[PDB]
Amino acid sequence: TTSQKHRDFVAEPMGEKPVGSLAGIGEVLGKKLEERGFDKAYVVLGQFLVLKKDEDLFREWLKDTCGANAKQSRDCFGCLREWCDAFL
Amino acid sequence: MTTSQKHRDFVAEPMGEKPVGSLAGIGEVLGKKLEERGFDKAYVVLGQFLVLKKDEDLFREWLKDTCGANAKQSRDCFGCLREWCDAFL
């Protein structure tokens, strides 16, 4: 199952969408990601790609960086993996 | 058209699983050094480009430090990634 936020993100190029457009990234996570430099969704894509799309390492990185719980990191990972399947 | 044909081929389409050597500026010598550091597909170098917020100075320095790229190689790689992003990101 997926959210509309997920479907909206995976349907099109992300351009300069803010980090909060990613599935799983709410206002609280988004704030903390922004304070650490990850202010646009593509910067988080960048980390996903630097980590060679590794689910365990990306989701652990997200937890360590902004405090994402397991559902939030699942949602964020899945939306980036599906976006990459469609556009990369 | 100022760019290389290799730039043109790269920016014309999604990169998928293309190797790092498909990037403009990344010949076989630079490509093997990138692979040895774990940057084995073009998308991993895109990742670093994006994590650095597409900043030219930081990206070109990173490339120099990571594989010894000269100024022309680093400008070509940066420009190829920048135009790819403008087309597809």
From Swiss-Prot, chain B:
On modification after translation, the UniProt record reads:
Ser-4 is the major site of phosphorylation as compared to Thr-2 and Thr-3. Phosphorylation on Thr-2; Thr-3 and Ser-4 disrupts its ability to bind DNA and reduces its ability to bind LEM domain-containing proteins. Non phosphorylated BAF seems to enhance binding between EMD and LMNA. Dephosphorylated by protein phosphatase 2A (PP2A) following interaction with ANKLE2/LEM4 during mitotic exit, leading to mitotic nuclear envelope reassembly. (Microbial infection) Phosphorylated by poxvirus B1 kinase (VPK1) on serine and threonine residues, leading to BANF1 relocalization to the cytoplasm, loss of dimerization and impaired DNA binding activity.
Q: What is the effect of changing residue 14 to A?
A: No effect on LEMD3/MAN1 and enhances histone H1/H3 binding
Per UniProt, residues of the HhH domain are: 20-35
Annotated positions of the Phosphoserine modification? 4
* Residues with the Phosphothreonine modification: 2-3
Q: Where in the cell is it found?
A: Nucleus; Chromosome; Nucleus envelope; Cytoplasm
GO MF term set: DNA binding; double-stranded DNA binding; identical protein binding; protein homodimerization activity
N-acetylmethionine-modified residues are 1
> Known consequence of changing residue 26 to A?
Reduces histone H1/H3 and LEMD3/MAN1 binding. Fails to promote HIV-1 genome integration
Q: What is the effect of changing residue 47 to E?
A: Abolishes homodimerization, preventing ability to cross-bridge DNA. Abolished ability to mediate nuclear membrane reformation at the end of mitosis. Abolished ability to outcompete CGAS for DNA-binding, leading to innate immune activation
Transmembrane stretches, start-end? none
The entry's stated outcome for residue 37 to E is:
Reduces LEMD3/MAN1 binding
Q: What is the effect of changing residue 8 to A?
A: Enhances histone H1/H3 binding
Q: Name one GO biological process term.
A: negative regulation of type I interferon production
Q: What is the effect of changing residue 27 to Q?
A: Reduces binding to dsDNA
Effect on the protein upon substituting residue 80 to A? No effect on histone H1/H3 and LEMD3/MAN1 binding
What's the reported outcome of changing residue 50 to A? Answer: Reduces LEMD3/MAN1 binding. No effect on Histone H1/H3 binding
**InterPro entries recorded for this chain?**
BAF, BAF_prot, BAF_sf
Outcome of mutating residue 60 to E: No effect on histone H1/H3 binding
Q: What is the effect of changing residue 64 to E?
A: Enhances histone H1/H3 binding
Describe tissue expression: Widely expressed. Expressed in colon, brain, heart, kidney, liver, lung, ovary, pancreas, placenta, prostate, skeletal muscle, small intestine, spleen and testis. Not detected in thymus and peripheral blood leukocytes.
Summarizing the annotation, the consequence of altering residue 25 to E is: Complete loss of dsDNA, EMD, histone H1/H3 and LEMD3/MAN1 binding
Q: Which residues carry this modification: N-acetylthreonine?
A: 2
What is the role of this chain? Non-specific DNA-binding protein that plays key roles in mitotic nuclear reassembly, chromatin organization, DNA damage response, gene expression and intrinsic immunity against foreign DNA. Contains two non-specific double-stranded DNA (dsDNA)-binding sites which promote DNA cross-bridging. Plays a key role in nuclear membrane reformation at the end of mitosis by driving formation of a single nucleus in a spindle-independent manner.
Designated name of the protein: Barrier-to-autointegration factor
Gene expressing this chain: BANF1
